[PDB]
From a paper:
To more rigorously probe whether even a minor transition accompanying ADP release occurs, which might only be discernable in more distal regions of the lever arm, we once again implemented a symmetry expansion approach for the wild-type rigor and ADP-state actomyosin-15 complexes, this time recentering the particles on the myosin motor domain to facilitate alignments capturing the distal converter and lever arm regions. This produced reconstructions with substantially improved density in the nucleotide binding pocket and lever arm region. Biochemical analysis demonstrated that the first myosin-15 IQ motif binds the regulatory light chain (RLC) rather than the essential light chain (ELC), as is canonically found in myosin-2 (4, 56), the functional implications of which remain unclear. Unexpectedly, other than the clear presence of nucleotide density in the ADP state and its absence in the rigor state, we observe no discernable rearrangements in the backbone positioning of the nucleotide binding loops upon ADP release, unlike myosin-1, myosin-5, or myosin-6 (21–23). An essentially complete lack of coupling between ADP release and lever arm repositioning strongly suggests that this step of the mechanochemical cycle is unlikely to be meaningfully mechanically gated in myosin-15. Our structural data furthermore suggest that ADP release is unlikely to be mechanically gated in myosin-15, which could facilitate the motor populating a nucleotide-free state in the cell to boost its nucleation activity in certain ATP/ADP concentration regimes.
The motor protein myosin-15 is necessary for the development and maintenance of mechanosensory stereocilia, and mutations in myosin-15 cause hereditary deafness. Unconventional myosin-15 (encoded by the Myo15a gene in mouse and MYO15A in humans) is a plus-end directed molecular motor essential for stereocilia development and maintenance. Here, we present cryo–electron microscopy structures of myosin-15 bound to F-actin, providing a framework for interpreting the impacts of deafness mutations on motor activity and actin nucleation.
Residue numbers in the entry:
A (entry chain B), B (entry chain A), C (entry chain C): 3 to 375
D (entry chain D): 1205 to 1734, 1749 to 1813, 1818 to 1923
E (entry chain G): 22 to 167
Write the structure that this text describes.
Amino acid sequence: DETTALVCDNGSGLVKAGFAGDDAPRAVFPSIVGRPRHQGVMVGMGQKDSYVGDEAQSKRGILTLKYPIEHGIITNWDDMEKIWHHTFYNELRVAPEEHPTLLTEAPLNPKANREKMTQIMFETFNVPAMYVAIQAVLSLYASGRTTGIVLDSGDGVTHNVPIYEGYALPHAIMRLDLAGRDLTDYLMKILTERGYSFVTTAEREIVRDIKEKLCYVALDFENEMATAASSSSLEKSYELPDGQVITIGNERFRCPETLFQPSFIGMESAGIHETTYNSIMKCDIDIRKDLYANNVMSGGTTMYPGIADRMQKEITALAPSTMKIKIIAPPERKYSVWIGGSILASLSTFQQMWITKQEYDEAGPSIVHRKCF
Amino acid sequence: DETTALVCDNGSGLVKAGFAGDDAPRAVFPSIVGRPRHQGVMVGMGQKDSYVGDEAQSKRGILTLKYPIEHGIITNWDDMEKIWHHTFYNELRVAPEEHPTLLTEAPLNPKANREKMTQIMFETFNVPAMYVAIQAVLSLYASGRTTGIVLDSGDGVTHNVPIYEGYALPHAIMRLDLAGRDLTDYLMKILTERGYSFVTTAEREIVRDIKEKLCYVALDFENEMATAASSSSLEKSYELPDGQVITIGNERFRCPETLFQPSFIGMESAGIHETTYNSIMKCDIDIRKDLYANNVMSGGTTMYPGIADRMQKEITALAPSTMKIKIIAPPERKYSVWIGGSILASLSTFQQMWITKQEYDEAGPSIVHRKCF
Amino acid sequence: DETTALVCDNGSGLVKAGFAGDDAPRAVFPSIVGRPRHQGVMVGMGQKDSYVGDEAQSKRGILTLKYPIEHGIITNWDDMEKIWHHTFYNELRVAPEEHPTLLTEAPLNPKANREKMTQIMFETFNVPAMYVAIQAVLSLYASGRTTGIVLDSGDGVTHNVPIYEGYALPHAIMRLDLAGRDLTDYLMKILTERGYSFVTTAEREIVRDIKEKLCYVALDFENEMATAASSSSLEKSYELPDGQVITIGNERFRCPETLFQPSFIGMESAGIHETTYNSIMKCDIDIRKDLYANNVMSGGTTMYPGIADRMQKEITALAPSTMKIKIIAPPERKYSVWIGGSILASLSTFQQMWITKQEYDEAGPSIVHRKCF
Amino acid sequence: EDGVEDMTQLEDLQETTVLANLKTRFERNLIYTYIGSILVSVNPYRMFAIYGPEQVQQYSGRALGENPPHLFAIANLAFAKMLDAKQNQCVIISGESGSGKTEATKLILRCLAAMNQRRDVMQQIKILEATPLLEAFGNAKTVRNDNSSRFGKFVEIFLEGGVICGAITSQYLLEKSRIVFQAKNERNYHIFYELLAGLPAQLRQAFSLQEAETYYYLNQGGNCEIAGKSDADDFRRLLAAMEVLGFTSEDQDSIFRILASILHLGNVYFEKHETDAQEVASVVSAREIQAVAELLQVSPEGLQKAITFKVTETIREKIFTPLTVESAVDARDAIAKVLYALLFGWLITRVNALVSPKQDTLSIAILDIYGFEDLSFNSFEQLCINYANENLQYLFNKIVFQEEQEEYIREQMDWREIAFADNQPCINLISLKPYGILRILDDQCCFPQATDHTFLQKCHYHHGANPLYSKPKMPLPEFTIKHYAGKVTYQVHKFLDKNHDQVRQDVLDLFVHSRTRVVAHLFSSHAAQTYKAHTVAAKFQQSLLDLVEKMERCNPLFVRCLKPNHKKEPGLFEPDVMMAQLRYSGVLETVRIRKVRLPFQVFIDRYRCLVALKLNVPADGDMCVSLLSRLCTVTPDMYRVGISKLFLKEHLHQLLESMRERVQNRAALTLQRYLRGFFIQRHFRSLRRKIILLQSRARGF
Amino acid sequence: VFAMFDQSQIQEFKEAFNMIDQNRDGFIDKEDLHDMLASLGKNPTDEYLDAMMNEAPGPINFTMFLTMFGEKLNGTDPEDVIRNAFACFDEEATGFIQEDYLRELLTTMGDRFTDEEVDELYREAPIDKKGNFNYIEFTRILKHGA
Ligand SMILES: Nc1ncnc2c1ncn2[C@@H]1O[C@H](COP(=O)(O)OP(=O)(O)O)[C@@H](O)[C@H]1O
Ligand SMILES: Nc1ncnc2c1ncn2[C@@H]1O[C@H](COP(=O)(O)OP(=O)(O)O)[C@@H](O)[C@H]1O
Ligand SMILES: Nc1ncnc2c1ncn2[C@@H]1O[C@H](COP(=O)(O)OP(=O)(O)O)[C@@H](O)[C@H]1O
Ligand SMILES: [Mg+2]
């Protein structure tokens, strides 16, 4: 009867899991699987062949860390099963065979990904029901709006979804394979100019922490670079795990600049502002005014200081001066997809949109293409 | 006892409804029905399958707008029922089963249209009485005259009806299938010369607004074109819903010119002035002098600035110089048909001309052919 | 004396140039201009700032490719000059200052486009004479007919032009901004369902080649989809430039289906068959029977296998069964516009229809509006 | 001796017959009547002999035969059922406010205390003294009554072989939305006005209180004073009751502090300040917030953040999200409602602990529940009220059908399965999980841009085909539900504003860490006990489910208190008022369930006119249905008359009656034309055969 | 009725009708009765005989005469019908019907008859003091003759 649904926002970098109706995810941990890369010499020490989540980062210095998801696509289907098993049993401490599960996926992913998630849910974990949602719709659900264009940016992909009065325009949906992971790689590359070498996968986590703590978005790039070159007031220090101290200057704002200039990492694509403007201009002329004032930002990559100010400046430069530009960046936008999924999964009217086990048995794994979206 | 009659002037483009005895229509809204053409992604948003009237234009950017009436003929009989239901219940807030209803129709329409309106009124809405009137007679009623020739022009049809001392000459009644909708289409076509593309049905409304706000009738076409080409003082700007600004020059007076030169839209018919002169010349020689001085103009298409001046000039050129030409264009001619219908439906002597429910039950839907006109 | 005229059919995607009187274009190459997007490190390598035509596709992997024409409108007037200079000098190896030039344009383009082409021809290249023709008339000239409705479809626009005994009906001319480029974009979008990512402008050419080689039009869409889903006999393989092999199934016929269902790419317009039927029904009742049997198809987008069969089926479904429907699709319809232009420019009676340099000097760039069409 | 006690024994039970019998009983000063085992009591507004030990011994046990109806019959019947089945039983006293349910409960409590223990009456004294506190904390003035109980009082008397142990009092179905919202011409609960009126002056200066017109939570009605009620006297009586009930001065001071904190929290306003990407509500004046913090011994900044901020708190961070004006208003109202609910629960728990029992083997339960509500303007509270009444009417109909089945098997007959249509469809229409009205309301309470109009549209779409659901013709903001008591129209005006009752964990944590012991204890207990109930409707449904779950382990007994006149005149009666009360009380549901029940001797006597019934003393095997076969070509469906005589269906009954009246007409015509023949006889053979003979004989010699 | 005849009274009934019912206009005439009375011969005079009969129901017609013969009194009034009619308004098969009960029954239902007609009936009906009217002997006397 009272079977609470499970909301699992398995992103490329973080797993956000919890119960429907809650205000925050119950379990948040990195989506990594680690394996030992050294020689075990003590008897009985070395009987574990895999580490998932936070225990993979506690043992970070002897493991090889691998991500099962790149750019929103699950490429390793055994590590993904390990991560889902960890989430269901060790983290949520719940039995999946008696809870409906709600999962999320990027708008323009291959269909085999969704079919394989459906098959794994219905055959390995024996869930009673299933649904796969689109992350931007859940961002709007969490934002308390029915009209707006969502700029979601995790660390796999960046996509734009314009929605008006609950109606989506699929032809105006954008997608970029440029997100937090590429920012971490670019910061790792440009940290070599000061003589800092981060090579292994365990140092990728240190570079990611540096990026989260120190990096920010400059309102204007050229004068910021001139100020950084003409003085030393923009430099900050960071302490490495072994006690060494590093210092970074213009690398603080040069790393997030690749979101607006993808040419830094050798991509021909346009910036996030131009992508958003292009997505808006692909909609009806009667929809554009409402979309201009409902720019909803979601994801962890949108958490840089000053990113909303620059997005508003760029859109104002692009859009006509008559329109009013608003960038909605709630302080909890890092969990907006999960919050929206929790809101949606707890609705009583939503109970008729689940993919039940009987429907799967009847129609194969392809039922998810007509039941979802 | 005191059952107030309802006057419903359902035209091709606008519905003008109200109560008999009032000085103005109670409800005026576009005669459109819209349906969603995009994909609904939010749960609970998208449960409405139709929008009628102003709510169809609020949601203009996600709907497909369709007109139930073209050229004064009802072609969609379910959308028409939806529009009538909206008018009776949501707009007038009245119960149709206790109010006689007065409807209007073009002079030379097919008989099936009138029979179907009678059947719908007497079987779906259960009105106690009914009458179908001719719009030009109501225009004369509103103008306070019994003698004159009426040039009514909505957006479906344009017709001429000469009436002398309350007697109509049916053999001199003209009809043109050229009206405001064709003007909107022609303006949409000629707006592409400056690079403005309006394609969808939602942009048809924007083009219609442009035509209403900026277009006018030139006193003489050739010198107006020469002036427009030799300078730039006739250009005006218009702001689109999303903030873009368009500019139009000679298109301001080239659009209404198709009323006097139907050859612009590929029609062999004569202009409205020549049609009026031909209708006058089909009457008795003793009627022509009075008709020449009682040219009554009605409808929304007659609302262009300078249209009366050019009509008088053209008729003076055609008619002999001895006669005196007068063009009566009251400032409220956009509602003259409704005003005349309201005047007629409130008369005490008119209570014997209704088509009662008993007469319909006795004689079928064909009673309207002998009771009306 | 014997100054041979030049026929230049500069379309949105391909330039078709040659000499009047020939049976085939002398030069056919893509209408692209490329610029380097990477860093030049060798001394002397990187002194070229632009690549036009086939040399822009040889260096495709280091350049940013841009089209000067979208939807039949020249948007970049310096790249267009570069392309015309290339055509005149490097391709045709002729001096433009001693050869009359014949150019083509879509029926309903902005007037500034034609005026600017006239100005560029008469002031930059110093041609002795000029003419701008309509592509559908040239298609009829190449087809050896004087009566028929032409469905021309390049990759910028799709237009219908009904002509009877050499007389055109301008009010029945249709235009769609849906053509080969939109088909390439839609195929690029739907290729992501199998995990194939084509992002850059250089991969647009690969997708275009895939569309040209593998795509076809299904006689009926629903049973074709059922057959494709119920088996795997409709799948074909394609080899990418670096050796990777891709496979596509229902995407082979789902891409050209947007010509008959523009709703796939989010357009409210009607299919090409309904557009052709509507254009026919806007003509005189005495013209329709001859037009029904003279449906002439022209352009590269009409080169899909099975497109003529489906066009005939759809028109037969729409048109009355009494009429006889014929779809004329000559095997060389990809060059019909150029062939017709070559036939027209070689006529002796046509020598009086050129726009001479003296007339341009007298009347400004606006002479082309009264001399042409 | 013209009236009757039990209407079950009647041969024709109709609404007119029930009204006539009830008014005949009332005119003879006979209040109580019987419907099977269901008692009906009309409030006479006059002191009647419903007491006295002689009545107790007269009704003591099964020695009376229940010839006269009385509440003592219900009491000793419940006692006998308990001693027979060794199981608990409950008595449900329903009815409108002022219809006499309260003194009915007090008389039942006195009768049980007199007949069970008869050696010690301390339990009844201890449970009667707690009544004024519950009356002050759970009643309010409505547009229909001046003192209406807005909750269901559940008194459970524990018995051990005739020994009265401690009693447990429980509350259910409390109206949460009245604390913060009142309609026109109605007040809040009496406790706030009594506190503001009768409080000592220095207490008011310490709490910074003022007159009731200033406070927002009380002045919404516009009439803060009742014409005919003294608040100070009741407040002093409440103090006396608390002193008797062991409430020390510190506890009373804490209660007054909590109530003053609620009142001051009700006076906080917000302004729409402009932020970089949103509108943020900020408190106008910090005086009220500081006053509430001081009265509740909590942090002022903590309270201001709990009012104007939303907390998203995971393991590794804690994010504060500013709220809007409406969200802040909802948070403040939810805090006030939870404070009041916790205070009431604490008072009832302390009262129960004062008279705590020892064992738990047998118990008698008394429920004082409010009844159907159909006002002029009708809204969410009455919707919940009618839902609860429908769920009780389900059990009422179950009991009535059980009695009907017992009657059908009471004598010797082949008992058939009798059809019975229960009111389950109405319950499903209101609160079924997929698309119930309350479920739609709960869904709209978290949907992004939901308002009352969208909720109405969803209801119309989902329930447009339901026979019980009805839409207005014109686009009016209302809908109609066909209850068991008739069509009821609900005005959707603030359904979403009245349903927002979400209290987050930050508020509970703030209130736990208070410097006063009672508030901290209450909130710690609440956190320990706490659930997917975030709305008023969900909590109401949970409480009603708990109440029902407490009430299937026993066979309920129903007492239906009615009202003869709205003017409280002792003797004046109206027929329309009786019809309305019978519809609302569900008494007519028995008549609806009955439709076959007609008698035997009627057929024996007054159905001989057809074929001049030849036989005498027709027996159990009498030719009765075959009579119909050979006389009226009527299908055999009337079950059996015999000894157990309940056979005739209504349409056949009317057909036979109207056949009888044609027969009477024809017989009268025959007799009258025969008598005309006799008149012509006497006329002609008088004026000739009695005159010509005399004349001829006189002429003779 | 034509089928049923009470042979005891048929002779008197038919003699009365043949003395009253003749081939005439249709109204009852004093001519035939007066001729039968004064067939021997008597001085005709109007000294004290100015009013002979005045309470006929109305005009008589041969068709209406046959209807009256078929329906009212000629060979009619089956005893079972009378007993059943009188038992319809009583619960005891004994036929003790209260006189006042029949008073209102006759004076309120059917084509209403006056108390005068009920008394007229009682001029020959034996009734007990308490009013429980019985009808066996009265019915037999009415049907056989007198
Ligand atoms: N405060 C921050 N500043 C900058 N980057 C951040 C911040 N917080 C998280 N990120 C980046 O965002 C990415 C994770 O965001 P998330 O939305 O959880 O991704 P996903 O949904 O794909 O798992 C990581 O690469 C992380 O480095
Ligand atoms: N001020 C105006 N100037 C020009 N055209 C107008 C104006 N007002 C209305 N119209 C045109 O007149 C048409 C509607 O007139 P109306 O008489 O209401 O039509 P109908 O009676 O057929 O509904 C519309 O096409 C509208 O664009
Ligand atoms: N065999 C083919 N099958 C499908 N599409 C084709 C084929 N050949 C050319 N096309 C498409 O037609 C377009 C070019 O046709 P063309 O008539 O040359 O265009 P334009 O005249 O506008 O330059 C290109 O988009 C190309 O992909
Ligand atoms: Mg009109």
